[PDB]
Amino acid sequence: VVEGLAQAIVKGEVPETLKDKHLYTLDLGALVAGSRYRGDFEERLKKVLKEIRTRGDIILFIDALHTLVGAGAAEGAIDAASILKPMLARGELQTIGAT
Amino acid sequence: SLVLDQFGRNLTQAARESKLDPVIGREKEIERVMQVLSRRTKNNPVLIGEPGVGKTAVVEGLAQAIVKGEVPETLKDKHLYTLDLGALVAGSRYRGDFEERLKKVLKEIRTRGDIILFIDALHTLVGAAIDAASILKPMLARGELQTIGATTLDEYRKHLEKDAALERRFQPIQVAEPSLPHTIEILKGLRDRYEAHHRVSITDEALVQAATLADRYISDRFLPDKAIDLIDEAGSRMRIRRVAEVDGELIAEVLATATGIPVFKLTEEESSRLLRMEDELHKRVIGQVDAVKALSKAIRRTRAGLKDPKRPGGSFIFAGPSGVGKTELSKALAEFLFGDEDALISLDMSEFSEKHTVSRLFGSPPGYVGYEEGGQLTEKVRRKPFSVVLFDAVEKAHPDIFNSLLQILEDGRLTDSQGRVVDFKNTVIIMTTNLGTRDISKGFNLGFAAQGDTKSNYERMKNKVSDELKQHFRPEFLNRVDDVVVFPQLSQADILKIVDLMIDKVDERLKDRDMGIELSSSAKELLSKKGYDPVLGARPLRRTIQREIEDSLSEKILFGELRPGHIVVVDTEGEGETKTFTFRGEE
Amino acid sequence: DAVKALSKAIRRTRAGLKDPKRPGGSFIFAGPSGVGKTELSKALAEFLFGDEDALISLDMSEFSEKHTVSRLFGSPPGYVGYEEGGQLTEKVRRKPFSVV
Ligand SMILES: Nc1ncnc2c1ncn2[C@@H]1O[C@H](COP(=O)(O)OP(=O)(O)OP(=O)(O)O)[C@@H](O)[C@H]1O
Ligand SMILES: Nc1ncnc2c1ncn2[C@@H]1O[C@H](COP(=O)(O)OP(=O)(O)OP(=O)(O)O)[C@@H](O)[C@H]1O
Ligand SMILES: Nc1ncnc2c1ncn2[C@@H]1O[C@H](COP(=O)(O)OP(=O)(O)O)[C@@H](O)[C@H]1O
Ligand SMILES: [Mg+2]
Ligand SMILES: [Mg+2]
């Protein structure tokens, strides 16, 4: 379904509200692949979310929402779900989930 | 108060600039809130209600009221701040910054002295990055914190009840679901904002029909939010197809394409179908005129709104002998009402002969294996709220199955081991049995019998079956069943009809290999004569058909006499008991 | 006749005269099927407590054999379901003002 949505967006059969929007599939594990030092995972996630906010014309796709609850949790590491919760509740980010 | 502003949200300022949804018809709970907040003990209020009723909307309306200055001087000059836990968690991973920023926040809170805090989703703060729970509890124990909380009823009873320390400091306020006029009022209030956002226009008829459709044909979600969802969804549909206008059939079809296939129209064409229901059913079921008539009458009465909306859409006890059409009628009903046989949820009760198997019906108790998975029936009903539930051979199950099953008959809702509630109001319940038909299956009576074998039939058989079943079953269970339908054994003439249907099935099996079969009237009469048995009724006919046709047809196929692209004509030879079948292959 | 008798009995039982060791009232309804027995009980409960849910109705047909009798009076320790009490007792715990 998301594949066909991307094909429709690139081909040009979408309403004018979307037109040229970029579907980016998130890649978990790559975010965690190097988060060993002080401030590595939270900073990466905040940076990517801020870049999405700055661009504006980006929409995210998560292929497994059940894996989102607990990604880089540690002695601290509030985790990715808590980071995503506030601005998702504020309605300033558009994401499509698949489970 | 830089720390306070960084880690808090002002509802009063937002109300001043009107960033909040309007509230109407909800002053009771806010009046209760400052009713209980003015006490000396248990001054901290907690709003208990089902999710979506608007507890957040409750505190938003409280902020609106305090901004409007409609509250006595006790609550005046008090700044309301919702504690933005997202602000606390965000950016806080320094080894010690967490709970220490909270220390600054709380010390500023007590220092200011004219402040009020709001805590939404109190479960994360009480009875739950985790040590923050242990800080607020002593603060409320001391008693100088005036906070307003909000919590779901099940969570409140499961977790907030056991916190004996805060039992003497919290007071509960219940919030009930809004009535349909209240929903209409809220829809009217949100009309302006939603029309401005969607750049469309909506009418009052759309509002009332959306509210009614949400109340009647949706059960998982709840009224004060799902009507808003439907109108926003319709507005999005009108926005994406291009001043736009939204009418009733528009939201009707949006709901139809949203969740399942609820009503899919409001015209009279489906009503004409319900007028032709008996003729439609008789294309799969042959000879059971009384059963089809009673079922059609009951479901037509249900469709007319003359039944209790709380109760399910129909309850039938199909009592009869073996192989008469008890399951074929259920399959035909499933095909007619929902377009496919897959809509029928069949449960063979022969696997529920032991009481401890009841756990597999609606899950296992907590703490045991298999708890993470739900019940095999409750979850399946939740997936498809519009389905026909069949309990095949209901008499072979343990009586605890009946104990659990009656609840569906009374209140149409079931609670599983996980505490969730599933609604059975949009389903048809059929329970099949062979009990009470021992005298109908065979009977000659003792003594000389006159010419007869024809009586009032349906009425006397129904009364006898009902009294026998209430002798064997619980009388209240039979009393609450919508209808008890007795299936008489098949006659001879209708058998000659059934043959045709069965032959058609065989023809389908020959369509895969590019073949076909045709029979003469004499062959059909011979098949009906050979396959007639008034005690069993239909399966012996199938055995006779298989033996006399497809045996000696498979042999011809294997031998090579019949090839793809051919038709097998079947006729009869001989007379009387010497009659036999003859097969001839042609192009 | 039955309504008058029940009214007189309720007057006896609610005048403060009979011993508190006795319950609120004890009645045996005998009659055929399809007559106003269950309806009369429901009306009595509705009048006394202002609600139709103030009626704990139990069928003794469920307890033909004694193995289920304890199910109505709390499970003794050591059973599969001992953590859950009997049906009759916990309903009185939830509401002592009801018609059994
Ligand atoms: N009136 C009928 N019209 C058409 N087919 C029928 C009729 N009665 C029986 N059959 C067919 O004969 C067989 C009888 O099976 P069916 O499911 O109807 O039995 P049943 O009445 O549920 O009996 P039981 O479950 O007690 O064995 C099926 O192949 C069914 O299609
Ligand atoms: N005396 C009555 N006055 C009014 N309605 C009555 C009366 N008797 C019966 N009915 C009606 O018939 C229904 C069945 O009566 P009810 O349930 O009281 O019977 P019952 O004799 O207590 O039951 P059963 O003997 O079958 O266990 C009632 O719900 C009511 O609608
Ligand atoms: N009294 C009301 N006035 C206006 N809108 C309401 C009211 N009650 C509920 N709503 C609407 O219902 C929606 C969901 O309510 P929500 O704030 O989620 O309640 P809760 O947080 O308790 O689940 C909100 O968007 C709100 O607009
Ligand atoms: Mg069957
Ligand atoms: Mg009775």
Contacts of residue C53 in chain B, CB cutoff 8 Å?
none
Nearest CA in chain B to C83: B365
Q: How far is CA C4 from CA B66, C10, C39, in A?
A: 58, 10, 16
Window B:527-566, CB contacts with A under 8 Å: none
Q: Distance between alpha carbon B498 and the CA centroid of its chain, in Å?
A: 35
**By the 8 A CB rule, do B189 and B84 touch?**
no
3-state secondary structure at position B425: coil
Output the CA angle B228-B230-B233, nearest 5 degrees: 105
C-alpha C92 – ligand 4 centre gap (Å): 44
- Ligand 2 centre to CA of B297 (Å) is 25
Q: Given the CA of residue B476, which atom of ligand 2 is nearest to it?
A: 27
> Are B356 and C59 an interchain contact pair (Cβ–Cβ within 8 Å)?
no
Rounded to whole angstroms, the Cα distance separating B370 from A15 reads 46
**What distance lies between CA B497 and its chain's CA centroid?**
38
Question: Is residue A90 a known part of a binding site?
Answer: yes
A63 marked as binding residue: yes
Does residue B545's CB lie within 6 angstroms of at least one atom of ligand 3?
no
Atom of ligand 2 nearest to the CA of C42: 18
Preceding-residue numbers of gaps in chain B (C–N over 2.5 Å): 128, 242
CB of C37 closer than 6 angstroms to any ligand 2 atom: yes
What distance in Å separates the CA atoms of residue B152 and residue B90, rounded to the nearest whole number? 26
Inter-chain contact B356–C61, Cβ cutoff 8 Å? Answer: no
Q: Locate the ligand 1 atom nearest the alpha carbon of residue B329 and give its number.
A: 18
Long-range contacts of B573-579 (CB under 8 A, 24+ apart): B579/B526
Q: B325 in ligand 3 pocket by Cβ < 6 Å?
A: no
Instruction: Specify the residue with its C-alpha closest to ligand 1, atom 17.
Output: B327
Chains that touch C (3 or more CB pairs under 8 A): B
Using a 10 angstrom Cβ sphere, with 0-12 exposed, 13-18 middle and 19 or more buried, the burial of residue B214 is buried
* Partners of residue B486 on adjacent β-strands: B319
Nearest to B576 by CA among B529, B510, B511: B529
B433-448 core/surface letters (b: 16 or more CB in 10 A; e: else): bbbbbeebbeeeeeee
Q: Calculate how close chain B gets to C45, using CA atoms only, in Å.
A: 19
| Contact yes or no for B475 and C62 at CB 8 A | no
Please give the interface size between B and C, counted as residue pairs whose CB atoms are below 8 Å apart: 8
Contacts of A78 in chain B (CB under 8 A): 89, 92-93, 129
Q: Which ligand 3 atom is nearest residue B175's CA?
A: 22
Closest by CA to B517, choosing from B550, B541, B487, is B550
Which secondary structure element, helix H or strand E, spans residue B196, and what is its range? Answer: helix B180-198
**C-alpha B292, offset from chain centre:** 25
A93–B contact, CB cutoff 8 A: no
Task: Give me C53's structure tokens.
Answer: 């849910």
Length of chain C: 100
Q: Min CA distance, C47 vs chain B (Å)?
A: 23
| C-alpha pair distances (Å), B126 with each of B19, B82, B130 | 30, 16, 10
Nearest-angstrom CA–CA distance, A26 and A61: 6
Using alpha carbons, list the distances in angstroms from residue B76 to A1, B63, B136, B390, B416. 54, 11, 25, 62, 47
Per-residue DSSP letter, B471: H
Distance of residue C58 Cα from the nearest chain B Cα, in angstroms: 11
Q: SS3 for B260-280, per residue?
A: CCCCCCCCCHHHHHHHCHHHH
Which structure tokens are listed for B313?
Answer: 């859409």
Distance, in Å, from the CA atom of C46 to the CA atom of B307, rounded to the nearest integer, reads 24
CA separation for the pair B406, B408 (Å, rounded): 5
Instruction: Work out the angle at residue B420's Cα, subtended by the Cα atoms of residues B416 and B423, and round it to the nearest 5 degrees.
Output: 85
Q: Which residues of C touch B356 (CB under 8 A)?
A: 80
Residue A97, helix vs strand vs coil: strand
Contacting residues of B for A16, CB less than 8 Å apart: 242
Binding residue ranges of B: 21, 24, 26, 52-57, 120, 142, 168-169, 286, 322-328, 392, 434, 480, 505, 539, 542
**In whole angstroms, what is the distance from residue B531 CA to residue B503 CA?**
13
B47 with B149: CB under 8 angstroms? yes
Task: With CA atoms as reference, report the closest residue to B6 among B85, B59, B79.
Answer: B85
Distance of CA B419 to the CA centre of its chain: 16
B547 DSSP assignment: I
Token digits for B320?
């009869």
| Under 8 Å between Cβ of B421 and B381 | no
**Interatomic CA distance for residues B77 and B62, integer angstroms:** 14
C-alpha A7 chain-centroid distance: 20
- Tell me the C-alpha distance between B25 and B19, whole Å: 20
Bridge partner residues of B582 (DSSP): B571
CA angle, corner B214, sides to B210 and B218, nearest 5?
150
With a 6 A CB cut-off, is B330 part of the ligand 1 pocket? Answer: no
Q: In angstroms, rounded to a whole number, what is the distance separating the alpha carbons of residues B564 and B579?
A: 29
Q: How far apart are the first and last CA of chain C?
A: 23
The sign of the dihedral angle between the CA atoms of B392, B396, B397, B402 is positive
Alpha-carbon gap, residue B68 to B60, rounded angstroms: 12
Touch criterion met for B and A (3+ Cβ pairs within 8 Å): yes
Checking DSSP bridges between strand B115-119 and strand B147-151, what pairing results, if any? parallel
Determine the residue among A45, A82, A93 to mutate to test chain B binding: the one whose Cβ has the most chain B Cβ atoms within 10 Å.
A82
List of chains touching B (3+ CB pairs within 8 A): A, C
- Residue pair B230/B254 in contact (Cβ under 8 Å)? The answer is yes
Q: Dihedrals φ, ψ of C81, to 5°? A: 125, 15
First to last CA, chain A: 13
Chain B: closest CA distance from residue C17 (Å): 38
> How far does residue A36's CA lie from ligand 3's centre (Å)?
42
| Helix and strand totals (H; E) in chain A | 3, 3
The tokens describing B14, both together, are 């937002």
Instruction: Report how this structure was experimentally obtained.
Output: cryo-EM
CA distance B77 to B66: 9
Whether the Cβ atoms of residue B81 and residue B9 lie closer than 8 Å to each other: yes
Residue nearest to atom 13 of ligand 2 (CA): C34
Instruction: Please check whether residue A89 touches B, CB under 8 A.
Output: yes
Measured CA to CA, the distance from residue B109 to residue B117 in angstroms comes to 9
Chain A hits for B86, Cβ within 8 Å: 82, 85-87, 89
Closest ligand to residue C36's CA? 2
* DSSP bridge pairs for B255: none
In three-state form (DSSP H/G/I as H, E/B as E, the rest C), the secondary structure along chain C is: CHHHHHHHHHHHHCCCCCCCCCCCCCCCCCCCCCCCCHHHHHHHHHHHHCCCCCECCCCHHHHCCHHHHHHHCCCCCCCCCCCCCCHHHHHHHHCCCCEC
β-bridge mates for residue B517, sequence order: B568
Q: Give dist(CA B245, CA B239) in Å, integer.
A: 10
Listed resolution, Å: 1.8
Residues B60, B21: contact at Cβ < 8 Å? yes
- The answer, for C62 touching chain B at a CB cutoff of 8 Å, is yes
Kindly state the DSSP code that residue B358 receives in the 8-state scheme.
G
Pairing assessment for the beta strands B421-423 and B413-415 based on DSSP bridges: antiparallel
For residues A79 and A71, is the Cβ–Cβ distance under 8 A? yes
Q: Which positions in chain A touch B242 (Cβ < 8 Å)?
A: 15-16
Q: Which ligand is nearest to the CA of C41?
A: 2
- Residue B1, judged by CB atoms within 10 A of its CB (0-12, 13-18, 19+), counts as middle
The one-letter amino acid code at C64 reads S
B396 and B353 Cβ atoms separated by less than 8 Å? yes
Provide φ and ψ at B442, rounded to 5°.
-140, 135
State residue B389 phi and psi, 5-degree precision. Answer: -95, 125
User: How far away, in angstroms, is B228 Cα from ligand 3 center?
Assistant: 10
- β-partners of residue B46 are B149, B172
Q: Is the shortest distance between the CB of B57 and ligand 3 below 6 Å?
A: yes
Strands A95-97 and B9-10, sheet pairing = unpaired
On whether the CB atoms of residues B345 and B306 are closer than 8 A, the answer is no
H/E element, B16? helix B11-16
